[PDB]
Amino acid sequence: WVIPPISCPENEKGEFPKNLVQIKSNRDKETKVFYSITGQGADKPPVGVFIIERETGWLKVTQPLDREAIAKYILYSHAVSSNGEAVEDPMEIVITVTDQNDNRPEFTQEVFEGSVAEGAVPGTSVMKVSATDADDDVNTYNAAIAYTIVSQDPELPHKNMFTVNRDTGVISVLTSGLDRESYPTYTLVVQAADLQGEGLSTTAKAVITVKD
Ligand SMILES: [Ca+2]
Ligand SMILES: [Ca+2]
Ligand SMILES: [Ca+2]
């Protein structure tokens, strides 16, 4: 069997500090030992965001974390006898910051210029609007963006001219009518909303200039 790793849920509240796991060294009864820790987040920037009870070897986190700032922390423990002799070899402990969804997805832009041709046939791909999300796009949907249009303008010759692939944010003519003659440009309001379209959201525009 083996020892499992250590992950600590970001943005935690309750009271601080909090007990991660517990450290040891068989020189428990043989002498007196004092545990300490080295690394960033311990004895380096960020300064002591992690501490260990010298007499119990109880790891600790004296505040909340940001998986966007640092998702993983690497921490090293040491054992010393009351007299100043390392009894154990510096052991390494790894601490993972799980994620939570506190990031509004961000359209890479606010104004995505675009262009379509009159002929165009219902299916023609006109352009694409694109966004980013920094929450754990790898082990949570928390960075799963889902696109939709909010308001087209002018709404002629029909409400709902173009449409947008949710999954990839591409706009394609949805029905016919585009007539450069009377509606030369169009102003689409796209909306990216993470969590597969059930969480944080943002918006930007799309200017589809109909061509001859
Ligand atoms: Ca965060
Ligand atoms: Ca998010
Ligand atoms: Ca996050």
The end-to-end CA distance of the chain, in Å, is 70
Residues whose CB falls within 8 Å of the CB of residue 210, separated by 6 or more in sequence, listed in order? 115, 116, 117, 118, 178, 179, 180, 183, 184, 185, 186
Q: Closest ligand to 194 CA?
A: 2
Three-state secondary structure call for residue 114: strand
Evaluate whether 67 touches 99 at the Cβ level (below 8 Å): yes
Q: How far is the CA of 7 from the centre of ligand 2 (A)?
A: 20
Residue list, annotated binding site for Ca(2+): 102, 133
Query: Pick from 121, 147, 122, 141: which is nearest to 204 by CA?
Result: 147
Q: Which residues pair with 190 in a beta bridge?
A: 149, 204
Q: How far is the CA of 98 from the centre of ligand 2 (A)?
A: 14
What DSSP element (H or E) covers 195?
helix 194-197
Method: X-ray
Cα–Cα distance between 128 and 32 in angstroms, integer? 66
């016919």: which residue's tokens? 176
Q: How far is the CA of 136 from the centre of ligand 3 (A)?
A: 6
Residues whose CB falls within 8 Å of the CB of residue 110, separated by 6 or more in sequence, listed in order? 204, 205
Residue 28, token pair as written in the block: 């428990």
CA separation, residue 152 to residues 47, 198, 201 (Å): 51, 22, 18
Q: Closest ligand to 70 CA?
A: 1
Cα–Cα distance between 168 and 129 in angstroms, integer? 8
- Ion ligand 1 contact residues with beta carbon within 5 A: 66, 68
Q: How far is the CA of 94 from the centre of ligand 2 (A)?
A: 25
Cα–Cα distance between 112 and 145 in angstroms, integer? 17
């102003």: which residue's tokens? 187
Residues whose CB falls within 8 Å of the CB of residue 161, separated by 6 or more in sequence, listed in order? 152, 173, 174, 175, 177, 178, 186
Instruction: Count the alpha carbons within 13 Å of 35 in the hemisphere toward its beta carbon.
Output: 23
Same-fold call for 2-100 versus 101-212: yes
Evaluate whether 205 touches 164 at the Cβ level (below 8 Å): no
Evaluate whether 157 touches 179 at the Cβ level (below 8 Å): yes
| Fold type of domain 101-212 | Immunoglobulin-like (2.60.40)
Q: How far is the CA of 143 from the centre of ligand 3 (A)?
A: 9
Cα–Cα distance between 117 and 123 in angstroms, integer? 12
Q: How far is the CA of 194 from the centre of ligand 3 (A)?
A: 12
Query: Pick from 143, 41, 131, 70: which is nearest to 102 by CA?
Result: 143
Q: How far is the CA of 100 from the centre of ligand 1 (A)?
A: 7
Backbone angles phi, psi at 180, to 5 degrees: -35, -30
Residue 136, token pair as written in the block: 């754990």
Q: Where in the chain are the domains?
A: 2-100, 101-212
CATH code of the domain occupying 2-100: 2.60.40.60
